[PDB]
From TrEMBL, chain B:
<dbReference type="InterPro" id="IPR001387">
    <property type="entry name" value="Cro/C1-type_HTH"/>
</dbReference>
<dbReference type="InterPro" id="IPR041478">
    <property type="entry name" value="TetR_C_27"/>
</dbReference>
<dbReference type="InterPro" id="IPR001647">
    <property type="entry name" value="HTH_TetR"/>
</dbReference>
<keyword id="KW-0804">Transcription</keyword>
<dbReference type="Pfam" id="PF00440">
    <property type="entry name" value="TetR_N"/>
</dbReference>
<dbReference type="InterPro" id="IPR009057">
    <property type="entry name" value="Homeodomain-like_sf"/>
</dbReference>
<keyword id="KW-0805">Transcription regulation</keyword>
<feature type="domain" description="HTH cro/C1-type">
    <location>
        <begin position="18"/>
        <end position="46"/>
    </location>
</feature>
<dbReference type="InterPro" id="IPR050109">
    <property type="entry name" value="HTH-type_TetR-like_transc_reg"/>
</dbReference>
<keyword id="KW-0678">Repressor</keyword>
<feature type="DNA-binding region" description="H-T-H motif">
    <location>
        <begin position="28"/>
        <end position="47"/>
    </location>
</feature>
<keyword id="KW-0238">DNA-binding</keyword>
<protein>
    <submittedName>
        <fullName>Transcriptional regulator, TetR family</fullName>
    </submittedName>
</protein>
<dbReference type="Pfam" id="PF17935">
    <property type="entry name" value="TetR_C_27"/>
</dbReference>
<dbReference type="GO" id="GO:0003700">
    <property type="term" value="F:DNA-binding transcription factor activity"/>
</dbReference>
<dbReference type="GO" id="GO:0000976">
    <property type="term" value="F:transcription cis-regulatory region binding"/>
</dbReference>
<feature type="domain" description="HTH tetR-type">
    <location>
        <begin position="5"/>
        <end position="65"/>
    </location>
</feature>
Length: 200, 204
């Protein structure tokens, strides 16, 4: 029932942790069982085959980040607050991983990129949710003259170190919640279709 | 004199091309003279040893980018225009490499990454010049309440795909001068020390 599905989700979480510890390859049903405190026979009740475990870890890889985005969009926060939290909450989790072990963040990025369907789905879903925020912001009068698609691109290009994991890795020591707050304020109060002299 | 310095720069350019193709591992000093058209003895007048040549190659690696930054800073453009040109003119040269062949840009990145001191120096000089643009903008009234150091960091963080080469590579297909112009306008009209609601309801 729900206790079974709660346990399966808990096992997938332990499996993701082992993958990160090992630097990618080396996950076995043997070690998962040993780490989870269950037997190999009991583990097969949750993962019938090794392949099912491998599928589960791939499907769950970016799920924690998806949940964070879903929670932010489901909140009652105004668009500016939503945009900040949309990036900030994910940044905080990734920074924590890097603070504990920079190699675990490296592994997280490397493994994630090998999961074709999942990483592409995640990136696409992220843009979809960013669009929902931008659309509401526009009804409030922000981003005057811009289309949602071009604004999604502009925001992704202005917030890259707080979102794109390879950029985040490069900039990590210089990143902060204080700086991201400044950026989001600058996006909201500075981004529009009105040419203001950058080129003329 | 002036002739000696032109030939030395020609030799550094040829040597740089050889290093990009094969590394220093393939930089035959007899071939540098042979591929530049001069004598090996005549090549000794420009570089005493191989170490002198390798240092010249490393020291000039980022010079095209330095020249661009110096040209922008030396101009009479207002700070907003300077900030745009400071990023755009370098971006345009990098995109041009990638357009010729994405491998050309990757090679430029990897070879440059080995010159760790020269990379560091370049970034430091870049921050110096961006700092000068920011200082002038501040005198005009921009970036109210912010310090120069934190503003340099904030601008670098907002323009990262147009400057950080690995990020530029990833974003390349989606980058444009039009988009960079929008970002610079947003930096100038949007960035300041006044909290405006990103982090709490009090700011809104
Ligand atoms: Cl983009
Ligand atoms: Cl920075």
């Amino acid at each position: 029932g729900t206790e079974h599905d709660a346990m399966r989700a808990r096992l997938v979480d332990v499996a993701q942790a082992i993958v990160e510890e090992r630097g990618g390859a080396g996950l076995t049903l043997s070690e998962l069982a040993a780490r989870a405190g269950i037997s190999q026979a009991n583990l097969s009740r949750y993962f019938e085959t090794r392949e099912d475990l491998m599928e589960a870890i791939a499907d769950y890889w970016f799920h924690p980040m998806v949940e964070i985005m879903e929670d932010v969009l489901a909140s009652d926060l105004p668009p500016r607050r939503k945009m900040y939290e949309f990036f900030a909450r994910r940044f905080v989790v990734m920074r924590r991983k890097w603070e504990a072990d920079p190699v675990k963040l490296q592994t997280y990025i490397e493994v994630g990129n090998d999961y074709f369907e999942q990483v592409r789905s995640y990136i696409d879903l992220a843009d979809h949710y960013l669009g929902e925020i931008i659309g509401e912001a526009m009804s409030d009068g922000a981003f005057s003259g811009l289309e949602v698609d071009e604004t999604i691109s502009l925001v992704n290009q202005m917030c890259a170190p707080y979102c794109a994991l390879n950029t985040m890795t490069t900039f990590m020591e210089r990143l902060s919640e204080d700086k991201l707050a400044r950026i989001v304020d600058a996006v909201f109060d500075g981004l529009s279709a009105q040419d203001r002299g950058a080129r003329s």
